[PDB]
Symmetry: D3
Subunit: 281 residues, 6 copies
């Protein structure tokens, strides 16, 4: 069926020997949005599935076929889905129930949903549905989350180039999920740093997706163990997978927006090892 980009899990000792292209081949997802298609990358790190869906002349659906590829009857038979629309207004129909998902609206689809259909309202400005999918043992209600219900928080300062607005869509304070959490953080114009100071967490893993970047800009995404850092240079609408032993911080050449997705054996966000940047240098 549809092509499935599979990434293996990786040992820190192996990762530290990878050259530039080697790092990209393992951790970088270069193509997230493809017209009238959905992309799908399967990571053996917590078995999270990441991708993008951009419906233009036709709808794009996931269900039976994808499920068979996963050894089950349908895609979400034993999985939960988190979707955030960074493009134009669209709709997501779950087993017949249509949800209007506008710019920056989001939708969490619980375990048990048989078919999910994505569509764009205007072909001129198509919806760009970014998603993260994780194994789920229990069914929680499918829920639409708007920027309102999120209650954004602006932190940082120009001097530390981290003035930004944090929007947490899928977290305990908003709704119940099995293990998936997602949020969107927008750096203010002229501000470049995200996740600083950095951190690592043995019991959870994160995937970052960068977007809303000018064609001539990029983000130097920092990864690796604190004392053995490496970087991947990324451009607009690309995602990066972070092993549990790795940090995940980035600095752009211009301001940008990014989405973070996190899974693991717990949802204790303070269960992490904070790393002061001075320790790195």
């Amino acid at each position: 069926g549809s092509a499935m980009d599979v990434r293996q899990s990786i040992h820190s000792a192996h990762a530290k020997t990878l050259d530039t292209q080697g790092l990209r081949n393992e951790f970088l997802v270069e193509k997230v949005f493809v017209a009238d298609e959905y992309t799908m990358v399967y990571s053996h790190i917590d078995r999270i599935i990441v991708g993008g869906i951009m419906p233009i002349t036709k709808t794009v659906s996931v269900g039976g076929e994808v499920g068979k590829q996963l050894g089950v009857s349908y895609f979400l038979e034993r999985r939960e889905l988190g979707v955030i629309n960074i493009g134009g207004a669209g709709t997501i129909t779950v087993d017949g129930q249509c949800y209007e998902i506008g710019h920056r609206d989001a939708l969490y689809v619980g375990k048990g949903a048989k078919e999910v259909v994505f569509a764009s309202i205007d072909t001129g400005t198509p919806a760009k549905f970014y998603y993260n999918c994780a194994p789920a043992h229990t069914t929680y209600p499918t829920k639409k989350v708007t920027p309102d219900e999120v209650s954004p928080v602006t932190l940082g300062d120009n001097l530390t180039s981290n003035r930004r607005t944090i929007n947490k869509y899928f977290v305990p304070d908003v709704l119940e999920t099995c293990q998936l959490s997602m949020g969107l953080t927008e750096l203010a114009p002229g501000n470049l740093w995200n996740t600083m100071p950095c951190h690592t967490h043995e019991r959870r893993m994160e995937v970052y997706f960068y977007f809303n970047m000018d064609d001539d800009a990029c983000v130097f995404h920092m990864m690796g163990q604190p004392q053995e850092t490496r970087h991947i240079v990324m451009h607009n609408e690309q995602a990066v997978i972070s092993p549990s032993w790795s940090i995940h911080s980035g600095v752009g050449t211009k301001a940008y927006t990014f989405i973070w997705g996190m899974v693991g054996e717990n949802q204790v966000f303070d269960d992490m090892d904070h790393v002061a940047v001075k320790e790195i240098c």
Copy 2:
């Protein structure tokens, strides 16, 4: 805090470069049963936790402290436990509820159980509780499983040295679990091969535990991708971790018994890639 042996996940390209000791350091658990203590190995491959508990002069408990090591309040706050006793009669008390677990009896403890205490009835023939623990999002009832509740099946033939009795303890036909399944297979005297022909399954992983072996015997456990196989020579009461891209088949120098534990994103046991041994050679 109690020592926690942590094993990282590993890429097939990395594993194929490991020498004999390297393979042992990564995949082999050399000591499972330690008097009056519990052993615990954490594998980043599906975050399964495995070990053994052998109470002799005192009971051994797991609960609050172990939970703190996992960033939670107690061991099973977000996990399920599967235990099989291969030693003498003992008991397992879950939050005050005492279960009599004799030789070859087993106990599944669901998510939410706060403290589990293991004990042996006779210090001369201590219980040997082998356990596998996996993340769980749903709470299923704690349940004792005995041999007469399991439907034993004899398969194989002497000519193929695989005459054996299969005993599936934690499987869909017996009880509901989130992702864990476990069983015990005993080879008839003079029969050496397990999991032959072999297989691999991208969506699940298994851990094998070998026991009931003479002091002068061993098992050559075959692992690796089908076309890049390797082996680890193991002795009595040792376990081996198998990545999803790896096979897991062993041949002893004498008959033996082993327990398999499996976790992953589905419990579709037929969702695998069968590998005819003739393909390997």
Copy 3:
């Protein structure tokens, strides 16, 4: 002239870094029997030459041409030859003297024989002459050895899966040779292990040839230093070269038969380092 597959000698430190294919390229002889042809593999480990001859529509001979390839006048000008027929009845003619070599009959040809011609009696069930050839400084009588003159010995036990019958064809008790010894060992149905416990011998080297195996079976041939073992998966009618620092033991998925050939600076079979399997694990 005829193609000659040459294998170099190898250092233990080099061998331990070889991957699956690397091990096969160095030590495995994949094609031993080819219709109306003879195969010839030259190993710089004691300069032993191994191969197979399967005459069907024509006879196959070795003599002048092969000798020139070795820098001499004829193949056995400074070499001795040991041949064992594992196929249908045939004949081996040495400088005009015809020897009837039936199934499991053997022939030792001493230094000085100028031409050796191999033939099959029935094209439907051709002779399969397996041979080992070694440098020889003195001429010993050409001698036909039948399964009678061998006096077989049955050892082992089903429990250790090594019940087998040992047939030593070319050994001091049967005839005089310069340095070559050969024998045939047949495992009883349902028995899998050969050369266990294993051993190594600095002053001699062995070559194993596996046959009489079902098309769906294989043998996991164990090699390498005792504490750094590796394996080569082999199928019907394939041979494997063992360096002096390496062990040579194998376990099949079904019973099989194999021939061993040994050369070196002495024929003291007890001059070896025995290795208890428990030492390996």
Copy 4:
């Protein structure tokens, strides 16, 4: 003799295999200013010598002894020196001629000067003389360069986090030198990027020195071939050597100031390969 830290030249194929510590060992100068001493690093890349001098309780001189270490009679017998004071007011006496070098004043010492003595006016706020020294075949006049003699130019913008003031001290428009050029660039508060977009120049090499940074800040200095970039995390008052095949661009966690030094076979600053950041990603 005074300790001389010697760095070899390096091939791009070699540099791309270096791990974090390896990169630091080769290209990073971790200690530049040491009380009452001078530091000295010799790079086989164009044989440039770099270091710092911080006189506190006594003067620090360079002359005869250093010359002997270079196989000549005195330090500047065949070399030219460029010094920039980033500390408190001080003086530099060249063969008896005393020059008052205040904060941000600089001094170029031409070939032929026998002894140079560095001093600080106030021990409470010692002068911090950063210097770059290169081979010189011609004698140009020793010359003091002050800020009002330099033509400061403000470039960049907050949106691209590169708002900065460029101060070129030793350049063709100011004075004549054999091959050395040096300048000081100060990023405005909240601006982090230097040398963006980046470049490479086969015929020249540069050394960057970062300072005026808070104790809790650092600079991720980007290096390497454009398609094989690496980074070195540096802290206050540390320098980095850049091979001709490498880029040199840094981004801080906070604003900072840095000095660049450049040598080579020409002083054609436009003789370089411009690299658009979009090419890297």
Copy 5:
């Protein structure tokens, strides 16, 4: 424009891992003389440029175009040139001034010369102009040097196979140059060794060019650190680049002649580390 063979600088730790071809690719210049063309090899080790010019049917000139390749207006705008003719009589015209350069005559061209034109008097026995070019900050007079003005010295002894005649063309005793020195040494018939005992010099580098060798002869050129020597097998009219950490000595299979060129930060020829051959063995 004209092809430019660029060689990077190299670290001793990198060089010691290079195989035979790797050493040749880095240090050997296989083609020095090409009919009606000039060859040009640029080494990042002191930025010396080496090559050969053999005019036959047309003159060969260097000037504007080559200069542009170096980022300047003309080849010698910031460089000095040393040329030695090992072929038939020719002429070298510098900015209109014609110099007659016969067999073994030489010409030093100082910084500032805009165009240099090479020509041969007889096409049957063309001039073979070998040159070395180095960065130069000051202009010294262009000067023709004949074998007379050189005052040759014959040293060595047949017993040590180093009987030879040394001819130093460009050295302080003959003329002033910025950093370049060159000479020609001819081994007597039957004498094979050059530069023995060997040496190294951190502050200078040398390039050796071997010629006047029979078609069936070669020179085993020894290089590398004294305790980690390697060799490059060379034939008639080939040059070899030597890093500052490397020795440069050679032994032929027959007598030969060679030219040495040296550049660096000083012209103190006794500033070196002598190495007794007994130290090497």
Copy 6:
């Protein structure tokens, strides 16, 4: 038991990765003559044993104990010995039979000799017995070989620095041996090259022993495949082992003498691959 220096056989792909010390560890025998002792090196390349014996205050014998180390009853039970005395007059007693072996006299001891005792006539000028020992299947008569029994041949020329006198002691024209041949070649003063042009022979191997060299001299012994040559720098009285795939040619810094020993499956000295030195370069 007496120390036995054992060298493994080696693959060309392995040998080409060895650094200077690695090559020495594998192929070089640094100490051959030790006062009142015998040295012994065992090479798995044809199982040749080499060493030296220098009796000063007492005799040195080889027999029973050494045999036990080889798994036999006595040293020469299945081996032949070739000895050449390069020191002062001495004697060699074989099972009671005393042979007077003066300077440059030699002795071949055939298979079956039980004990060999070496002695020196004058302690002031001790005998220096260099020996090569190889497996032997046939018993040939023990025989003393003197210079006047050898047919010396002078070859080479000063122009090719290979003027030398060849003395073949153990060869077909002198006596019968199983596989061993040995000779002594002395270069005339001022001549440095041996075995030039070089060669390789798949069916035989050689060991070279250099001596009569001044304390300030050495020999650059060339080895390796023709297109992947390496060298080992040796001093007085040191030996070097050459794999069948390797060349063996040396060039001294002064004249010297050397002994070659050769074994293999044939004694056809013309059965080799001639390599023109021009092929190497």
